[PDB]
């Protein structure tokens, strides 16, 4: 019971929060899974690959450039201030809040979630596919050959961008063709991320799951290993152990308060 979850939400220490795409969805972030895994003539799950982009850099910088700029209209939801509102409170008492999620929209960020886990990167960051630098780009368009690019309907020309025209390495001498920071499909996650991550399921004494369930990736990965433990874990969603179900910013602000 809410009752009774709020009782060990006083006495822990250590809360993990992991962060689904459902989190996302209820700020009108167009999730690109399920029913909705579809920009064009292709799905989502086609076009965030390392052989798409070798093929075709300027389709997947297309249909990337149209994620970052969707984010424009985007605001951070009551899901998300509930669980900025909580960390900055709990750290003022020496109690540690982390959030882990595979959200690539940085609306956590945006919300004020400090000790923020992206275990997937971010639409707002690049990686030079020569050099390997990581930076902080939120410039819009990417690049002006982006310019009025990236219309998510079928039929839509190509941009056709060569990829000189594509987003290039602002570092002295390298010119190289830059990526989103983001895991594409059949790609790793960042060793350094789940060592972090690893770290903090060890360490935590409460643990929630919400917009996404310990069923489906990636809380799989990480709550059933916490449960293990004897830790509790508390479930938030759309569908000890609890089960809170709901839209996140309804239920949240009240478990978090
Ligand atoms: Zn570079």
New binding site residues.
Partial sequence: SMADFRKFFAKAKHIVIISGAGVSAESGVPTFRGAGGYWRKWQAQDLATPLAFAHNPSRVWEFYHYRREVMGSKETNAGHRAIAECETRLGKQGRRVVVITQNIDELHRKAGTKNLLEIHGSLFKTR?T??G?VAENYKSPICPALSGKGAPEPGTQDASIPVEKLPR?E?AG?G?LLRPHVVWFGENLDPAILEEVDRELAHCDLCLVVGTSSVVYPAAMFAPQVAARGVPVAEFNTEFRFHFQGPCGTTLPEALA
């Fill in positions: 030079c020569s050099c630098v390495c570092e390298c190289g």
